[PDB]
């Protein structure tokens, strides 16, 4: 059961790249967009790339990238629904919201008014 994470604003899909960078793409054939949700209990989940096995990480400096370190505190995420299939994704450790920017860069923010935090999650 894989899912795709998508910006409501632009339709750009979140991608975890083989080089560990995380960004957005409109390429539905990119293998870096297929993600697996793994429950950690207590309302937390991990997001893992099927293609390379890398985990999505939101870092304390606001950068977002891929890691293999299961002990990294930045991998714990919470999916908070806003209604009608729109969600916010936050780091447990720092409370930062994942943001997909219109230029396809991906980073962390605290701005609840930022259009790039508005995400959709759909099954593959």
PDB file of C-alpha atoms in Angstrom:
ATOM      1  CA  UNK A   1       0.000   0.000   0.000  1.00  0.00           C
ATOM      2  CA  UNK A   2       1.823   3.064  -1.322  1.00  0.00           C
ATOM      3  CA  UNK A   3       0.623   6.652  -1.220  1.00  0.00           C
ATOM      4  CA  UNK A   4       1.428   9.866  -3.067  1.00  0.00           C
ATOM      5  CA  UNK A   5       1.775  13.206  -1.223  1.00  0.00           C
ATOM      6  CA  UNK A   6       0.633  16.137  -3.338  1.00  0.00           C
ATOM      7  CA  UNK A   7       0.570  19.932  -2.996  1.00  0.00           C
ATOM      8  CA  UNK A   8      -3.004  21.208  -3.118  1.00  0.00           C
ATOM      9  CA  UNK A   9      -1.710  24.531  -4.458  1.00  0.00           C
ATOM     10  CA  UNK A  10       0.234  23.264  -7.498  1.00  0.00           C
ATOM     11  CA  UNK A  11      -0.416  19.538  -7.820  1.00  0.00           C
ATOM     12  CA  UNK A  12       3.323  18.881  -7.398  1.00  0.00           C
ATOM     13  CA  UNK A  13       4.116  15.442  -5.949  1.00  0.00           C
ATOM     14  CA  UNK A  14       6.618  14.974  -3.137  1.00  0.00           C
ATOM     15  CA  UNK A  15       9.651  12.978  -4.206  1.00  0.00           C
ATOM     16  CA  UNK A  16      12.490  11.456  -2.157  1.00  0.00           C
ATOM     17  CA  UNK A  17      15.425  11.307  -4.575  1.00  0.00           C
ATOM     18  CA  UNK A  18      18.201   8.671  -4.710  1.00  0.00           C
ATOM     19  CA  UNK A  19      20.653  11.414  -3.655  1.00  0.00           C
ATOM     20  CA  UNK A  20      18.707  12.100  -0.466  1.00  0.00           C
ATOM     21  CA  UNK A  21      17.213  15.427  -1.546  1.00  0.00           C
ATOM     22  CA  UNK A  22      13.461  15.937  -1.223  1.00  0.00           C
ATOM     23  CA  UNK A  23      11.523  18.104  -3.672  1.00  0.00           C
ATOM     24  CA  UNK A  24       8.408  18.318  -5.847  1.00  0.00           C
ATOM     25  CA  UNK A  25       7.696  17.081  -9.345  1.00  0.00           C
ATOM     26  CA  UNK A  26       4.859  16.826 -11.854  1.00  0.00           C
ATOM     27  CA  UNK A  27       6.413  13.649 -13.245  1.00  0.00           C
ATOM     28  CA  UNK A  28       3.934  10.914 -12.302  1.00  0.00           C
ATOM     29  CA  UNK A  29       6.429   8.332 -13.633  1.00  0.00           C
ATOM     30  CA  UNK A  30       9.156   9.304 -11.156  1.00  0.00           C
ATOM     31  CA  UNK A  31       9.803   6.324  -8.872  1.00  0.00           C
ATOM     32  CA  UNK A  32      10.712   8.602  -5.957  1.00  0.00           C
ATOM     33  CA  UNK A  33       7.090   9.618  -5.372  1.00  0.00           C
ATOM     34  CA  UNK A  34       5.851   6.248  -4.088  1.00  0.00           C
ATOM     35  CA  UNK A  35       5.820   6.396  -0.300  1.00  0.00           C
ATOM     36  CA  UNK A  36       4.874   3.921   2.418  1.00  0.00           C
ATOM     37  CA  UNK A  37       3.327   4.975   5.709  1.00  0.00           C
ATOM     38  CA  UNK A  38       4.513   3.027   8.737  1.00  0.00           C
ATOM     39  CA  UNK A  39       2.733   3.508  12.065  1.00  0.00           C
ATOM     40  CA  UNK A  40       4.856   4.280  15.122  1.00  0.00           C
ATOM     41  CA  UNK A  41       1.884   4.479  17.483  1.00  0.00           C
ATOM     42  CA  UNK A  42       0.847   7.524  19.543  1.00  0.00           C
ATOM     43  CA  UNK A  43      -0.315   9.282  16.382  1.00  0.00           C
ATOM     44  CA  UNK A  44       3.110   9.184  14.714  1.00  0.00           C
ATOM     45  CA  UNK A  45       4.156   7.710  11.386  1.00  0.00           C
ATOM     46  CA  UNK A  46       7.229   7.340   9.199  1.00  0.00           C
ATOM     47  CA  UNK A  47       7.181   8.053   5.469  1.00  0.00           C
ATOM     48  CA  UNK A  48       9.519   5.800   3.500  1.00  0.00           C
ATOM     49  CA  UNK A  49      10.510   5.758  -0.167  1.00  0.00           C
ATOM     50  CA  UNK A  50       9.669   2.425  -1.764  1.00  0.00           C
ATOM     51  CA  UNK A  51      12.369   2.848  -4.401  1.00  0.00           C
ATOM     52  CA  UNK A  52      15.374   3.488  -2.142  1.00  0.00           C
ATOM     53  CA  UNK A  53      14.150   2.736   1.377  1.00  0.00           C
ATOM     54  CA  UNK A  54      14.989   6.240   2.589  1.00  0.00           C
ATOM     55  CA  UNK A  55      12.909   7.870   5.340  1.00  0.00           C
ATOM     56  CA  UNK A  56      11.560  11.423   5.094  1.00  0.00           C
ATOM     57  CA  UNK A  57      13.152  13.691   7.702  1.00  0.00           C
ATOM     58  CA  UNK A  58      12.274  17.241   8.781  1.00  0.00           C
ATOM     59  CA  UNK A  59      15.374  18.773  10.378  1.00  0.00           C
ATOM     60  CA  UNK A  60      15.619  21.331  13.220  1.00  0.00           C
ATOM     61  CA  UNK A  61      17.189  23.889  10.849  1.00  0.00           C
ATOM     62  CA  UNK A  62      14.114  23.718   8.613  1.00  0.00           C
ATOM     63  CA  UNK A  63      15.605  21.602   5.830  1.00  0.00           C
ATOM     64  CA  UNK A  64      13.858  18.428   4.671  1.00  0.00           C
ATOM     65  CA  UNK A  65      15.727  15.434   3.284  1.00  0.00           C
ATOM     66  CA  UNK A  66      16.101  11.649   3.260  1.00  0.00           C
ATOM     67  CA  UNK A  67      17.823   9.526   5.904  1.00  0.00           C
ATOM     68  CA  UNK A  68      18.456   5.859   6.713  1.00  0.00           C
ATOM     69  CA  UNK A  69      18.777   6.524  10.456  1.00  0.00           C
ATOM     70  CA  UNK A  70      15.786   5.018  12.304  1.00  0.00           C
ATOM     71  CA  UNK A  71      16.967   6.765  15.485  1.00  0.00           C
ATOM     72  CA  UNK A  72      16.830  10.242  13.940  1.00  0.00           C
ATOM     73  CA  UNK A  73      14.129  12.220  15.802  1.00  0.00           C
ATOM     74  CA  UNK A  74      13.230  14.132  12.646  1.00  0.00           C
ATOM     75  CA  UNK A  75      11.551  11.137  10.993  1.00  0.00           C
ATOM     76  CA  UNK A  76       8.545  11.049  13.345  1.00  0.00           C
ATOM     77  CA  UNK A  77       5.626  12.733  11.579  1.00  0.00           C
ATOM     78  CA  UNK A  78       1.999  13.475  12.382  1.00  0.00           C
ATOM     79  CA  UNK A  79      -0.721  13.669   9.735  1.00  0.00           C
ATOM     80  CA  UNK A  80      -3.389  16.192  10.781  1.00  0.00           C
ATOM     81  CA  UNK A  81      -6.488  16.310   8.543  1.00  0.00           C
ATOM     82  CA  UNK A  82      -8.151  19.651   7.847  1.00  0.00           C
ATOM     83  CA  UNK A  83     -11.204  18.247   6.106  1.00  0.00           C
ATOM     84  CA  UNK A  84     -12.184  16.963   2.659  1.00  0.00           C
ATOM     85  CA  UNK A  85      -8.911  15.077   2.258  1.00  0.00           C
ATOM     86  CA  UNK A  86      -6.655  18.072   2.917  1.00  0.00           C
ATOM     87  CA  UNK A  87      -3.958  17.476   5.554  1.00  0.00           C
ATOM     88  CA  UNK A  88      -1.076  19.151   7.368  1.00  0.00           C
ATOM     89  CA  UNK A  89       2.120  17.154   8.009  1.00  0.00           C
ATOM     90  CA  UNK A  90       4.193  18.054  11.087  1.00  0.00           C
ATOM     91  CA  UNK A  91       7.426  16.882  12.673  1.00  0.00           C
ATOM     92  CA  UNK A  92       6.779  15.591  16.193  1.00  0.00           C
ATOM     93  CA  UNK A  93      10.204  16.701  17.394  1.00  0.00           C
ATOM     94  CA  UNK A  94      10.036  20.323  16.252  1.00  0.00           C
ATOM     95  CA  UNK A  95       6.395  20.923  15.307  1.00  0.00           C
ATOM     96  CA  UNK A  96       7.415  22.304  11.918  1.00  0.00           C
ATOM     97  CA  UNK A  97       4.992  21.876   9.024  1.00  0.00           C
ATOM     98  CA  UNK A  98       6.191  20.358   5.773  1.00  0.00           C
ATOM     99  CA  UNK A  99       5.837  22.829   2.932  1.00  0.00           C
ATOM    100  CA  UNK A 100       6.051  22.122  -0.800  1.00  0.00           C
ATOM    101  CA  UNK A 101       6.909  25.484  -2.388  1.00  0.00           C
ATOM    102  CA  UNK A 102       5.722  26.541  -5.857  1.00  0.00           C
ATOM    103  CA  UNK A 103       9.270  26.174  -7.179  1.00  0.00           C
ATOM    104  CA  UNK A 104       9.270  22.540  -6.059  1.00  0.00           C
ATOM    105  CA  UNK A 105      11.642  23.070  -3.122  1.00  0.00           C
ATOM    106  CA  UNK A 106      10.526  21.369   0.114  1.00  0.00           C
ATOM    107  CA  UNK A 107      11.203  22.743   3.599  1.00  0.00           C
ATOM    108  CA  UNK A 108       9.775  23.388   7.074  1.00  0.00           C
ATOM    109  CA  UNK A 109       7.618  26.317   8.203  1.00  0.00           C
ATOM    110  CA  UNK A 110       5.477  27.437  11.154  1.00  0.00           C
ATOM    111  CA  UNK A 111       3.269  29.665   8.994  1.00  0.00           C
ATOM    112  CA  UNK A 112      -0.205  28.125   9.040  1.00  0.00           C
ATOM    113  CA  UNK A 113      -1.257  30.571   6.318  1.00  0.00           C
ATOM    114  CA  UNK A 114       1.400  29.290   3.888  1.00  0.00           C
ATOM    115  CA  UNK A 115      -0.363  27.723   0.878  1.00  0.00           C
ATOM    116  CA  UNK A 116       2.411  25.136   0.484  1.00  0.00           C
ATOM    117  CA  UNK A 117       1.596  23.252   3.696  1.00  0.00           C
ATOM    118  CA  UNK A 118      -1.746  22.114   2.293  1.00  0.00           C
ATOM    119  CA  UNK A 119      -1.300  18.520   1.209  1.00  0.00           C
ATOM    120  CA  UNK A 120      -3.311  15.648  -0.210  1.00  0.00           C
ATOM    121  CA  UNK A 121      -2.602  11.947   0.287  1.00  0.00           C
ATOM    122  CA  UNK A 122      -3.844   9.456  -2.267  1.00  0.00           C
ATOM    123  CA  UNK A 123      -3.343   5.692  -2.635  1.00  0.00           C
ATOM    124  CA  UNK A 124      -1.258   4.202  -5.411  1.00  0.00           C
TER     125      UNK A 124
END
